[PDB]
Design a protein around this ligand. Structure first.
Ligand SMILES: *[C@@H]1O[C@H](CO)[C@@H](O[C@@H]2O[C@H](CO)[C@@H](O)[C@H](O)[C@H]2NC(C)=O)[C@H](O)[C@H]1NC(C)=O
Ligand SMILES: *[C@@H]1O[C@H](CO)[C@@H](O[C@@H]2O[C@H](CO)[C@@H](O)[C@H](O)[C@H]2NC(C)=O)[C@H](O)[C@H]1NC(C)=O
Ligand SMILES: *[C@@H]1O[C@H](CO)[C@@H](O[C@@H]2O[C@H](CO)[C@@H](O)[C@H](O)[C@H]2NC(C)=O)[C@H](O)[C@H]1NC(C)=O
Ligand SMILES: *[C@@H]1O[C@H](CO)[C@@H](O)[C@H](O)[C@H]1NC(C)=O
Ligand SMILES: *[C@@H]1O[C@H](CO)[C@@H](O)[C@H](O)[C@H]1NC(C)=O
Lengths: 50, 49, 98, 96
């Protein structure tokens, strides 16, 4: 009898959750293909193994 | 294929256009407060002031 | 190109995407009697027996000349120097015309 | 936990995020900057650093004549970042 506040609260929390999922997807998924470094590690002296 | 003496250089190009959808505004709504709660009623409006 | 949309705006971004790439052997610079030549605007590539100076975003191979390469330093500090000749359009003409 | 609250898992786990980051690192190490603007074209890292120096107005001959010094400084900075960081993550901890 108090109304439909609970539906609004559930909707807001669900929206926040999907927002965070899409947010991390936007931040990290910037490329369409997966690249891998070649097995031999030589770049003129730069040490990327760290 | 990476090496310290190998470079890849394009010999052709493709021009492609893409969309970018961006909302800039929403519906300008404005609801007054006194009529929404009380409603055309002086007796109820007297408990709102 | 902007386009109006209901309660929003739409852009048609015209971009330039390269395509049809092919491998080329490169080199940081070229040598001439202990005088390195670096590319003024471009990159050195190879066809198997001789080198060229093409731009970075397109294949426009050009014969290496002093016009499009600037001299800097000797041929000892830089690693990966390859031996090739450049074209100087001053010597053969003077030799022929005396 | 047991009063009406739950925590959903993220859409992509930490392994997948690390795989994305590794792919991006490999792309920017091998291809340079072109892997984000079309097909990825390989280029030796010294030449990529020569192009990146040319961006800030410093000519290419500066890098090659002292490439070893550049490599040593880069290695020193990357190795010292762990000491500088592990001894902070304030903006990540305050959210949690
Ligand atoms: C660069 O690519 C374009 C296509 O993106 C090529 O254009 C084609 O050229 C062939 C030539 O035999 C034609 O039969 C096609 O109809 C063309 N297609 C289009 C869409 O115009 C172009 O030839 C390529 N250039 C080089 C030098 O390879
Ligand atoms: C690489 O580029 C050269 C430059 O045009 C192509 O033509 C060669 O040019 C040299 C000098 O002018 C000649 O000695 C060669 O005989 C030319 N090549 C042929 C096949 O005749 C060359 O064709 C290109 N490709 C290769 C694999 O060298
Ligand atoms: C490229 O050029 C350099 C310099 O001319 C060559 O190095 C010389 O090679 C000759 C070969 O008999 C030696 O006698 C000299 O002592 C070398 N040094 C100098 C300073 O002349 C080099 O061999 C050439 N070829 C390559 C692949 O580097
Ligand atoms: C790196 O360059 C050296 C000589 O410049 C060559 O012997 C070596 O094979 C190169 N590395 C790769 C992975 O091709
Ligand atoms: C580039 O592609 C050609 C064509 O397949 C191949 O023969 C060559 O080994 C590749 N790599 C280089 C450095 O040319």
């Amino acid at each position: 009898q108090y109304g439909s506040f609970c539906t609004q609260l559930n909707r807001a929390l669900t929206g926040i959750a999907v927002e965070q999922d899409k947010n991390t997807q936007e931040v990290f998924a910037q490329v369409k293909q997966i690249y891998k470094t070649p097995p031999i590690k030589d770049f003129g002296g730069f040490n990327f193994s760290q | 294929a990476y090496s310290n003496n190998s470079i890849a250089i394009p010999t052709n190009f493709t021009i492609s256009v893409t969309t970018e959808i961006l909302p800039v505004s929403m519906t300008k709504t404005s609801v007054d407060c006194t009529m929404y709660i009380c409603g055309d009623s002086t007796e109820c409006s007297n408990l709102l002031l | 190109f902007p386009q109006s949309a209901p309660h929003g705006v739409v852009f048609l971004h015209v971009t330039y995407v390269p395509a049809q790439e092919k491998n080329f052997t490169t080199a940081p610079a070229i040598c001439h009697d202990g005088k390195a030549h670096f590319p003024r605007e471009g990159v050195f590539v190879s066809n198997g027996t001789h080198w060229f100076v093409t731009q970075r975003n397109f294949y426009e191979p050009q014969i290496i000349t002093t016009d499009n390469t600037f001299v800097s330093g000797n041929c000892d500090v830089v690693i990966g120097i390859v031996n090739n000749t450049v074209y100087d359009p001053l010597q053969p003409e003077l030799d022929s015309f005396k | 936990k047991f009063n009406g609250l739950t925590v959903l898992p993220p859409l992509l786990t930490d392994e997948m995020i690390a795989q994305y980051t590794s792919a991006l690192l490999a792309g920017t190490i091998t291809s340079g900057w072109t892997f984000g603007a079309g097909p990825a074209l390989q280029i030796p890292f010294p030449m990529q650093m020569a192009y990146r120096f040319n961006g800030i107005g410093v000519t290419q001959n500066v890098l090659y004549e002292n490439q070893k010094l550049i490599a040593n400084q880069f290695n020193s900075a990357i190795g010292k970042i762990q000491d500088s960081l592990s001894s902070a993550l304030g903006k990540l901890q305050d959210v949690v």
